[PDB]
């Protein structure tokens, strides 16, 4: 399965609602299981630099089937994936990207959020992904 545009827009609206509740102005990106952009929403007032980061976060999450901050926990100096961010035209490995997982457990795309603290980004991404699916893959080696 691929994330449909209807699903992507529902997730964007759920994410935007959580952003407004937290008092934030976010960029919200949805990509499909190929990393290709499916939908994008820059809230009024959101940081311009967050446009690229939201899309890179979604890409990173779908490229590896993992929330972005979980990759960053492995890519610190000394870590097993130090330097992974150079790959794939640039990854983002701090929180804000979350895989979207369909009913039969397959990853159909991902959401990426940027524009506030990384903790607020994660909470907004989670609200957006949870409105359309499960958000986690089991048995991940990382």
């Amino acid at each position: 399965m691929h994330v449909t545009i209807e699903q992507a827009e529902k997730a964007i609206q759920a994410a935007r609602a959580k952003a407004v509740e937290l008092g934030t102005q976010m960029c919200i990106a949805i990509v499909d299981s190929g990393g290709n952009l499916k939908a994008f929403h820059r809230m009024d007032g959101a940081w311009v630099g967050s446009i690229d980061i939201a899309q890179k976060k979604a890409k990173t999450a779908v490229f590896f089937g993992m929330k972005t901050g979980q990759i960053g926990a492995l890519s610190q100096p000394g870590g097993s994936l130090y330097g992974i961010e150079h790959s794939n035209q640039g990854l983002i490995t701090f929180p804000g990207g979350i895989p979207i997982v369909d009913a039969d457990g397959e990853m159909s795309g991902a959401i990426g959020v940027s524009g506030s603290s990384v903790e607020n980004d994660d909470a907004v991404a989670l609200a957006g992904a949870s409105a359309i699916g499960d958000t986690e893959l089991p048995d991940h080696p990382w």
Copy 2:
């Protein structure tokens, strides 16, 4: 996009004057609120590598509404923004970029300065931005 070419040039001159006072040779860049280049001045003798750095600093500051070194305080190993410099075709997160903030409290652009120690870079940037507005 609100910073005028008149204001950009005034900031460059206030920055150049602070640079001469500190004994430095600087590149100075002004970008608008979208990160697009508005004005640029390379003092004679400035390091060639500072041309790109000053522009990236100005871009970085306006992309996030923060002085560049304040982003670097969060992007160290173990920091919440570790790796952010890979975004946006390359950020610079040590001092030298400062938001330009108009009287309405809206950010209209940013200045970026490179060519000396990062302390002098930030002093020169601040002199320029403060000539045409607030900086936070």
Copy 3:
């Protein structure tokens, strides 16, 4: 003294068989001694992100004649090669790239593997490289 396509495909099928034995889904790249792509195989279900990583690992290994993780051991903060990953359109310096060394001890190419833990990546790369030659200069 360049890996042939028959050797590249032998190395890919050996790496793939090791991958399955370990329960993994890998991307496996073979490059030549110039770093140019020779063969590629993305196993069904492999991480999309591992496509680029497997190729960069093979390139990195052949660009310096050593296993990728040995470079990473030197490119930590404070290490002699800190920042090397910015060169060559991007290196990968965690395990999974191994050089392919001919009979007379000359490097003819490299293998790169991505898609699981880095230790599983190295194990699968070694199975692939060892099937067609030596693995060290």
Copy 4:
């Protein structure tokens, strides 16, 4: 600006030092704008050192410093952390040195890659010392 006569003399001095040390190096010369003036890849040198030698030469001339002097400042917690993202990629470990003319004006830089960074720096110094300070 460094002349091609000077660039080639620096490459030959660097090459001779590299052979003395048993190394196979890539040697690059750039002008004061960072544009390539000469390049020499010794037989058997690491293919990856082609790009690194050139980025080292560019880095040294872009800031008027030896490359490793910049890396000393760009560690975590250092004042230049992240600088390598600039200028399409810098190299900040040893092997790049400025070429400075009789007066203290920088005319170019040399960049060397292909061995340990210490050997890289010794070979670079031999080349740059052959034609100036």
